[PDB]
Amino acid sequence: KFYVREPVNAKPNWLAVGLSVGASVFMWIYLIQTHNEDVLEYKRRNGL
Amino acid sequence: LRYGLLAAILGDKTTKKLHEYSRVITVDGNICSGKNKLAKEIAQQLGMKHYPEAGIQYSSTTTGDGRPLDIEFSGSCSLEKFYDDPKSNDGNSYRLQSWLYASRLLQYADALEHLLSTGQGVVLERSIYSDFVFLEAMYNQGYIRKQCVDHYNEIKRLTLPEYLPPHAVIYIDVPVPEVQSRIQKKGDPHEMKVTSAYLQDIENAYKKTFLPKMSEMCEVLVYDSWEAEDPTKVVEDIEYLKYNKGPWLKQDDWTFHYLRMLVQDKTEVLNYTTIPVYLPEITIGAHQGSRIYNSFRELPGRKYAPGYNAEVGDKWIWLK
Amino acid sequence: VKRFFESYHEVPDGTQCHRKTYITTALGGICGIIGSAYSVSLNPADSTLEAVARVGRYTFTAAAIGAMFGLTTCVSAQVREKPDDPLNYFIGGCAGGLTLGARTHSYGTAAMGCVYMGTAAALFKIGKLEGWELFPTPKV
Amino acid sequence: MNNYIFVLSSLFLVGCLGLALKPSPIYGGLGLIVSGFVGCLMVLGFGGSFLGLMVFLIYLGGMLVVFGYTTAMATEEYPETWGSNWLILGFLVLGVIMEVFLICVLNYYDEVGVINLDGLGDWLMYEVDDVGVMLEGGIGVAAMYSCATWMMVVAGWSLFAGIFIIIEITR
Amino acid sequence: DGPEKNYEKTLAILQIESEKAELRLKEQEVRRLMRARGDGPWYQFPTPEKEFIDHSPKATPDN
Amino acid sequence: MNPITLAIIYFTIFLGPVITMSSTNLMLMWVGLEFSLLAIIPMLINKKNPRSTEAATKYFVTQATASMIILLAIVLNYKQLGTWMFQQQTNGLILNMTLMALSMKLGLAPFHFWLPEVTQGIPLHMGLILLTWQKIAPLSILIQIYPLLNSTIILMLAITSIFMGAWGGLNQTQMRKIMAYSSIAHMGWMLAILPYNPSLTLLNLMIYIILTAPMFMALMLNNSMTINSISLLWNKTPAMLTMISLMLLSLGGLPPLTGFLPKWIIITELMKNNCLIMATLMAMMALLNLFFYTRLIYSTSLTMFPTNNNSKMMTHQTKTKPNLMFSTLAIMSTMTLPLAPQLI
Amino acid sequence: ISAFLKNAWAKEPVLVVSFSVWGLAIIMPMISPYTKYASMINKATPYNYPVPVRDDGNMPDVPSHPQDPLGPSLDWLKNL
Amino acid sequence: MMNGRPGHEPLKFLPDEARSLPPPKLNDPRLVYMGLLGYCTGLMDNMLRMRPVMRAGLHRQLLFVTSFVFAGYFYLKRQNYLYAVKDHDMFGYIKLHPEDFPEKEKKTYAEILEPFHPVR
Amino acid sequence: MPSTFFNLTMAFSLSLLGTLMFRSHLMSTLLCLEGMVLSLFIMTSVTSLNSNSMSSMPIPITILVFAACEAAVGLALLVKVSNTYGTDYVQNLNLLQC
């Protein structure tokens, strides 16, 4: 509206955003599961 | 997607879009040669896009708000001041000439980008190729210094070779006495002080350099004043031109792609115009440049990038 | 053979002056010839006689520095009763620096070279006493 | 025959000496042709066959292209031969005599070592399978189609990429 | 808190910073010995591989 | 270049080094070297200007000579030990020649005169490859033979290159040549610590790459190639100045920045091995590097240099060139010392 | 593409023949009963000596005499 | 130095042997510093591209911080494994060779005649 | 074998020496490189034939292939420098001094 050349980044790329947020939440879930598994295995292999 | 190697592979081939009227015509002539009317009419009849002549405000008009900015941001060079005092000891003349050359370069890049993208043709009013006439005329009259001539030629050497020349040039020849008559009639208070010697130097530069140089590669047509009217005649000539001469013939998809990549990035286009050759006329001091830059980077809409200015009316920033 | 150069330390300083002077002169000459070969291979000279003059000048200058260094170091160690005192190598290196300044026709080189070369020689002597090792082999 | 191989190696050395002295590229190509022939003969005398012939073939082709290039680019109004330049001539003779004297010196200092002119030709071949059949170097080379396919892959890729590289260098 | 906290914490500091030192010097000694004698897990430089030897009956008996 | 040439050439440049570092056979390591050599040249001569052609020729001649010397080393090792890998029993001259020829390939002094010229001639986006990706293979070849190298030769080359790079950096005004000389100095450190503990040689290689790539992309941003030209960033692109300063200082090797970690750890190892004189001299002479980086910092970030009238249109126009990798590498190179223990 | 193939057949027959022969060179080896026999024949050819193996008394298949029925038989090669 | 350690398995990030070590605590200072680095990198990207430094690109910033922490966790785990391996080999070798690392007996301070240098 | 290897090593040494010291024409330098290639191939060939190692005879051919590829690249570079300067003289290759 203000700009003559249509701003390249006029509206968010919903695709790129959804991918970024999904990757972030997946990464956090995977990391938490892995940490829990590592704790359990350390206890298992070292007799608690 | 930004035009890149990926898009080129997947399609977007320029030769796929080029057509008969996809050309780069340049209308040229002395001051008040009636260039603008003929340019608009050729563009309209041939279905191409007309680019008004680049002014001191071209970049500002074509970017951001599209509103003319202040002169301090837009070059601090005044055509009216040039005419009032052409030998002013503040070096306005060569500042104006360099700014106009750079703006013509930007306009040429935009027109070439448009041609290579949409496939439509472009009509232009003078261009970087024809711009040296004004500098030569200033030097001959004695308004600018030989070092400034050197600087301009250097920048042209760095910039000009990259871009393809226009397909056809259409030069309107009008003698200096009638040029003066037309200028008097136009009646611009500051323009009326242009000297016959200056006009004749522009004409001499034109005829004795530009047309011989352009005819080597482009297709050059010359129309006198009486022929210039009735543009339909000029449109007919353009229609029945055959371009067997020029660098354009040897291009192909990949050369067009590299030219497109160069033009698309306006930074690379104007990079060499800012070569750090320390010539007092163009050189700015640190304090003045900093003041101008800080003032510019808080204008409405020019503080952040185009898409991220919340003041002007951009939103979704927290996601963009 | 490297025996000739390693013979420098057969007997502490102040003794076998002539032999030690010969050894240092030879070492200086070798360094000068190497430097001259580099300086001719790069930055060539107009005439081949110019090139050979250059090699002669470099070689003789370096040999002179080495000879003066050895002579002064041995003379100091001999006249004074301290055989292994690094101040001797310092005085010898200063003598070498002064000789370099004379050869180059400049007092500033005399002074700078005295300080730097004397410090280098003194540190060399200190290293030889204290057992320092340049270019060691991996011990970890 | 006793001195066969040593003579061939010395001739190879002389051809290489000429090439190093670097006359005009035409004489360089001629010298390298002679050297390639002598090297092929040495390989042949060492029980080889296919390898020597292959070197000779490939080198003939290479020097053909090289000569074609020299006539076009590496040319002078007065090409200099080995004998034309007195320094080249003198150092050619000097190199020949120097190699002779160096041979003598090494023989004297090490009566048996790098060179054994006495006892020369007594160690050319070490072992041979007297009653064998499949012992020909072509078999070993053809192994690239079975046991060393990695060699073939890398070499073929090298030539393939060479095509594109050459075209784009000469664009 | 009182003097005990500082005094006994300082004792712990000294314990840790003396054990670390002894272990660092011990690292120097062990690496020196392993490098010089090749008898340990570290500094075991490679040698060619036996697996790719060919033991099949050859075409000449005396191989 | 058409897409198929781009694919093949870039793929071969990537292949060569991978072959070198994944080959157990000396001839195959040599094959990797040749792959890199052949494939880089068309990228170098892509511009087809008079300077570009000469730079490509210099590169070609030097690298071909180095490859032949290495091949001689390989062939003689074959003649001796009937194998294609260097063993403890291998003749000392063979290893000396290998180190010498790989030094020529790497650009180390006194075989260093070729690198500055080629870097000056070639464009920045290929200068990055030349000064980063093309060093991995030769240094890998050395690291695979580290226990057998010669301490005297290696230390001599390393100190020579430190001195030479430091001295050469001062005189040059050109950024391309400055980065070439910086490359020489850092490689000098890498080879200095190679014979003693190659893990730190690899650490230095990583940090040098991670610091040079950001700087080269910074130069690419405005095609800056001179002190005067880079002086105009306060006008053309103010934002980058802070990180450019930090990155130049890190490459120089000030303590708080990461650049310290390579030099500090390498000095520590050398001292452990009793290499006091060489360690002292190298540390001392590594300060001319800080000097000729501080001059750049003065020119760009701390002082504002004269600008031109036409930079106003550069201001007007938009910019979309800086990558994500720039930010990632720059921060992770100039703000990572507190994680140093994990690095070594 | 019938039109382009038909034109190629007449205006550039050489390339048509070359591509067709290359295609056949790849196709036929997969489609042919006899392909398996090449490697068997090359294995049948006895370049080196057949080394006898010491009889530990529990080797039941390898023969004791060359003319014994046990062991590989080149009847398949004889009547390929 | 550790490349030739017996049992070395080539190009394995975390060998199975590493599961026996206590895994990193996920609020470790090292991982927190990693998150801080990621956040700063996001802010730097904004500033370079001329964006609202802290407002814009929140998805980008979140990805940066999470990626830094994710990489940091595993890299830290591998480093812990490597240092633990070094200590294991250390102490095993020392135990094997008691002769080359004898245990020093220390005299008390009473019996040690430390020279005294007056500071006059 | 011993005398042959000595002479071949000397030949390679001389060709390397010739390459290291130029003499105006770049083509001659390329030829000297090519001669070193010849000598190295001969060394490998004789070593393999002497040892009866038929598994290493695939390697001299690889040497030839890669040396040919680099020689072709060299010739192309010669073509380009000639187009630039009119000759192949190495003196003209001095722009980058500045």
From TrEMBL, chain C:
<feature type="disulfide bond">
    <location>
        <begin position="94"/>
        <end position="114"/>
    </location>
</feature>
<keyword id="KW-0812">Transmembrane</keyword>
<dbReference type="GO" id="GO:0045271">
    <property type="term" value="C:respiratory chain complex I"/>
</dbReference>
<dbReference type="Pfam" id="PF02466">
    <property type="entry name" value="Tim17"/>
</dbReference>
<keyword id="KW-1133">Transmembrane helix</keyword>
<dbReference type="GO" id="GO:0005743">
    <property type="term" value="C:mitochondrial inner membrane"/>
</dbReference>
<keyword id="KW-0496">Mitochondrion</keyword>
<comment type="function">
    <text>Accessory subunit of the mitochondrial membrane respiratory chain NADH dehydrogenase (Complex I), that is believed not to be involved in catalysis. Complex I functions in the transfer of electrons from NADH to the respiratory chain. The immediate electron acceptor for the enzyme is believed to be ubiquinone.</text>
</comment>
<protein>
    <recommendedName>
        <fullName>NADH dehydrogenase [ubiquinone] 1 alpha subcomplex subunit 11</fullName>
    </recommendedName>
</protein>
<keyword id="KW-0472">Membrane</keyword>
<comment type="subunit">
    <text>Complex I is composed of 45 different subunits.</text>
</comment>
<comment type="similarity">
    <text>Belongs to the complex I NDUFA11 subunit family.</text>
</comment>
<keyword id="KW-0999">Mitochondrion inner membrane</keyword>
<dbReference type="GO" id="GO:0006120">
    <property type="term" value="P:mitochondrial electron transport, NADH to ubiquinone"/>
</dbReference>
<dbReference type="InterPro" id="IPR039205">
    <property type="entry name" value="NDUFA11"/>
</dbReference>
<feature type="disulfide bond">
    <location>
        <begin position="17"/>
        <end position="74"/>
    </location>
</feature>
